[PDB]
RNA sequence: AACGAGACUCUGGCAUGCUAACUAGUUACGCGACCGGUCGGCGUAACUUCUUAGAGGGACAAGUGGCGU
């Protein structure tokens, strides 16, 4: 059927968490050919949840001042990053991306409550939408930091970021920063 | 509606000690189809026509003119 | 014993179905004008799934379509819409041929001649007009016309006494003559504005309806009031039975049928299965049209669907 | 262990700058128990939260 | 926020109190009856009056409103007011009367009334609210 | 015979002309395959892939494109073709297949039949652009 | 009751409905070049989809479901 870039199918992908199942749009009506739709998901609240997760990944990679409109470069970055993971893991890059999104999101956080000066932070829950958004943010932040001044091309540092997260490995920026984030929130219970 | 419903004038008068400024603003009446005032009404003024009183019939009558 | 059961519904519009037209030459074709600027021809399949499906869509107008009619030959269709226009179609290719201009406000009604060579239209201008089939106006009827909108005007099926029947929001019934514009009878006795007038097939009686809900039937011959019938709600449409001498009227969301020989009701037509919407008024019935045979009744609704009723023979 | 609770209604906004939301959540297992919790981010009714520490009940921030 | 103003609300109330017969529930017809009668400037102001008219006519079916007065509604409310049951509420076969009222009627030379029935008064003299 | 229908992104305006043919789709007298940006190739292929090669078999569509940029122009073509095939039906076939194609198109993408109304906001003095302002100096 | 607010003016988005076009085009047909196709090569007639700009429409919390003394 309609498969991403014409070669990566969607019907085989399964979302594990019931919590993020309705906040990840990958399977039936979100099966598109490209991460490019000229969408208007930023007009009302909770509309972005209907944005395909691959297109959501595409946007956050055109970050820092020199790339703010160069979407076609990020479409090929994601296109090449999906054809590399499948060569290493042999699995569906969509499944790898979903498992990375599930793994790298924080489930508890801390919020400033004490008056300015001494920090008296509390412990609060995290919305599923914020958990998805922050997983995407962490995954895209780890991809461009690991590639800033390396011979390694980007879309190879993104692939390595996504592989290490779907395994829940400590060799991953997003997993490392998610573990450090829930650690401090437990301290504030 | 201020660009046609008002008329403005600014003038100087030179007295022995200095200059006095004189400003005159006049807001004109409506005057429909008239030399003075704008023919257009004020944009916020609504004129509702009073209906002509009539007697609704009680019994049916045909008029065979 | 003669009742009517819902045989089905036709869907495909997105606005109030405003008028329905039927022709005797094509039993399998009806026209529906709706408040979405489009006229739809219907092909009636009468299958188990749905009664009929749209076949042609006439996209010519730029406002609500207020009335439509079919010529005796089932190839032409005359329309009148709210942008101010009277449009002639061609049901073979579905493309307009002539445009009929001259009214300054929205044209409310349409009527096409029995001999297929003269047109009458009434508008919000308070002026009735007569037209030729080439796109010109013959008379403008400014001398003592309706002091309010001409709600509906239509011809009579008699060549013996050329008569046109006019309707208006001034609460009066006018009778005219052809070859001139002379008034014959100014029938008085309607309260509230009027919406529809219909002429009996024999050409001797006419029926009109308005906001009072009272539907009076007036003798087109001898010119005297003969019947007054009580419909509870406001009447939006009236119609006469081709052969069973019945009278049909859309009173709000119900349809009352009068024998006119027994002077009493025969059947009430309303679908009230839905009860969840306990805060909204039921959809209203806009228009009516009987089949050529006389056993089918199509009704348009503010619901924007067309409903078909069948006369139970048993 | 980890509990999953379902948001039933949104009460209001709490926090020094209005950054957190009061919710009352109903558990999936032993659904008879509903508790007051604070969240961070956009929340609407029907959202299901993952509670790591499932004994606390919320208070004003 | 989408809140009308006193200009549109006043004009709509006047239109409704003056032309109740022609106005109705449909917006697109009330939009066309306003232009025929009221001398209104442009479409945007015409529509905001003819929309509040349509909104405000539904309330009339629910009952009267404290802002308009139709004489037809006056007639309907007078038909409602001219209501009296066949048997009034003040003609009763038996009227219950306290022993203290009976003595007052005795002083009023009304000791021959036959519809009366003296009842037993309450014994506990407890008709005050506790203090505190 | 033929129908002429346009599609419109920001300032680009494509016009597609459809008549009786054998399966030719060409923009600017050029094959649809080799429109210059190949990255967005599937957006031009979306209508034919969704509907099927057998619907563009008695129709011959030629597109002329002008204005705007590369990405806007590609988006103006996929809408123009989709609208022109919907307009070719309901005029030359019936009011039954137009509904089918219109539904199939509009569930997948509304921008395949409805135009995005967004256009650039004008610059305002006191800032580099519509909303951004110049840096304000304190002391 | 009045000013201010709102209304008002300009602008953007819609109209295969109207009025028009050699200082805008499109379609068709010829002549021509090249291998039925391409031509912003050349000339005629169909008109206004595209371009231009005038008139008039169109959106009002109007419809539905909730909340609100």
From Swiss-Prot, chain B:
Positions carrying Phosphoserine: 47, 62
Transmembrane parts of this sequence: none
Annotated phenotype, changing residue 65 to R: Does not affect ubiquitination in response to ribosome stalling
Residue numbers of Phosphothreonine PTMs: 58-59
Source organism, top-level taxon: Eukaryota
Glycyl lysine isopeptide (Lys-Gly) (interchain with G-Cter in ubiquitin) cross-link site: 40, 52
Chain positions of cross-link Glycyl lysine isopeptide (Lys-Gly) (interchain with G-Cter in SUMO2): 52
Entry PTM: Methylation by PRMT1 is required for import into the nucleolus and for ribosome assembly. Sumoylation by SUMO1 enhances protein stability through increased resistance to proteolysis.
Subcellular localization(s) per the UniProt record: Cytoplasm; Nucleus; Nucleus, Nucleolus; Mitochondrion inner membrane
Entry similarity comment: Belongs to the universal ribosomal protein uS3 family.
Subunit structure of this chain's protein: Component of the 40S small ribosomal subunit. Identified in a IGF2BP1-dependent mRNP granule complex containing untranslated mRNAs. Interacts with HNRPD. Interacts with PRMT1; the interaction methylates RPS3. Interacts with SUMO1; the interaction sumoylates RPS3. Interacts with UBC9. Interacts with CDK1; the interaction phosphorylates RPS3. Interacts with PRKCD; the interaction phosphorylates RPS3. Interacts with PKB/AKT; the interaction phosphorylates RPS3.
Protein's UniProt name: Small ribosomal subunit protein uS3
Organism of origin: Homo sapiens (Human)
Span within the parent record: 163 to 227 of 243
Curated annotation (Swiss-Prot), chain D:
Stretches that traverse the bilayer: none
SUPFAM superfamilies: Nucleic acid-binding proteins (SSF50249)
Top-level taxon of origin: Eukaryota
UniProt keyword Metal-binding, yes or no: no
Purpose of the protein: Component of the small ribosomal subunit. The ribosome is a large ribonucleoprotein complex responsible for the synthesis of proteins in the cell. Part of the small subunit (SSU) processome, first precursor of the small eukaryotic ribosomal subunit. During the assembly of the SSU processome in the nucleolus, many ribosome biogenesis factors, an RNA chaperone and ribosomal proteins associate with the nascent pre-rRNA and work in concert to generate RNA folding, modifications, rearrangements and cleavage as well as targeted degradation of pre-ribosomal RNA by the RNA exosome.
Similarity section: Belongs to the eukaryotic ribosomal protein eS28 family.
Name listed for the protein in its UniProt record: Small ribosomal subunit protein eS28
Organism (species): Homo sapiens
Lineage, top ranks: Eukaryota, Metazoa, Chordata, Craniata, Vertebrata
Swiss-Prot record, chain E:
One Pfam family per UniProt: Ribosomal_S17e
Protein name (Swiss-Prot/TrEMBL): Small ribosomal subunit protein eS17
PANTHER family noted in UniProt: 40S RIBOSOMAL PROTEIN S17
Clinical note on disease: Diamond-Blackfan anemia 4: A form of Diamond-Blackfan anemia, a congenital non-regenerative hypoplastic anemia that usually presents early in infancy. Diamond-Blackfan anemia is characterized by a moderate to severe macrocytic anemia, erythroblastopenia, and an increased risk of developing leukemia. 30 to 40% of Diamond-Blackfan anemia patients present with short stature and congenital anomalies, the most frequent being craniofacial (Pierre-Robin syndrome and cleft palate), thumb and urogenital anomalies.
InterPro entries xrefs: Ribosomal_eS17 (IPR001210), Ribosomal_eS17_CS (IPR018273), Ribosomal_eS17_sf (IPR036401)
Modified residues (Phosphothreonine): 129
Similarity comment text for this entry: Belongs to the eukaryotic ribosomal protein eS17 family.
Keyword Transferase: no
Modification type N6-succinyllysine: residues: 18
Annotated compartments: Cytoplasm; Nucleus, Nucleolus
Covalent link location (Glycyl lysine isopeptide (Lys-Gly) (interchain with G-Cter in SUMO2)): 102
GO molecular function: RNA binding; structural constituent of ribosome
Positions of crosslink type Glycyl lysine isopeptide (Lys-Gly) (interchain with G-Cter in SUMO1): 102
Recorded name of the encoding gene: RPS17
Keyword flag Manganese: no
Organism: Homo sapiens
Phylogenetic placement of the source organism: Eukaryota, Metazoa, Chordata, Craniata, Vertebrata
Subunit structure: Component of the small ribosomal subunit. Part of the small subunit (SSU) processome, composed of more than 70 proteins and the RNA chaperone small nucleolar RNA (snoRNA) U3.
GO cellular component: cytoplasm; cytosol; cytosolic ribosome; cytosolic small ribosomal subunit; focal adhesion; membrane; nucleolus; nucleoplasm
Curated annotation (Swiss-Prot), chain F:
Described function: Component of the small ribosomal subunit. The ribosome is a large ribonucleoprotein complex responsible for the synthesis of proteins in the cell. Part of the small subunit (SSU) processome, first precursor of the small eukaryotic ribosomal subunit. During the assembly of the SSU processome in the nucleolus, many ribosome biogenesis factors, an RNA chaperone and ribosomal proteins associate with the nascent pre-rRNA and work in concert to generate RNA folding, modifications, rearrangements and cleavage as well as targeted degradation of pre-ribosomal RNA by the RNA exosome.
Source organism (scientific name): Homo sapiens
Gene Ontology MF annotations: RNA binding; structural constituent of ribosome
Modified residues (N6-acetyllysine): 53
Name of the protein in its database record: Small ribosomal subunit protein uS9
Alphabetically ordered keywords of this record: Acetylation, Cytoplasm, Nucleus, Phosphoprotein, Ribonucleoprotein, Ribosomal protein
Gene giving rise to this polypeptide: RPS16
Keyword Ribonucleoprotein annotated: yes
Coiled coil: none
GO biological process, alphabetically ordered: cellular response to leukemia inhibitory factor; cytoplasmic translation; maturation of SSU-rRNA from tricistronic rRNA transcript (SSU-rRNA, 5.8S rRNA, LSU-rRNA); ribosomal small subunit biogenesis; rRNA processing; translation
InterPro entries with a match to the protein in the record: Ribosomal_Su5_D2-typ_SF, Ribosomal_uS9, Ribosomal_uS9_CS, Ribsml_uS5_D2-typ_fold_subgr
GO CC, any one term: cytosolic small ribosomal subunit
PROSITE patterns cross-referenced by the UniProt entry: RIBOSOMAL_S9
Family the entry assigns: Belongs to the universal ribosomal protein uS9 family.
Record has Acetylation as a keyword: yes
Compartment(s) where it occurs, according to its Swiss-Prot or TrEMBL record: Cytoplasm; Nucleus, Nucleolus
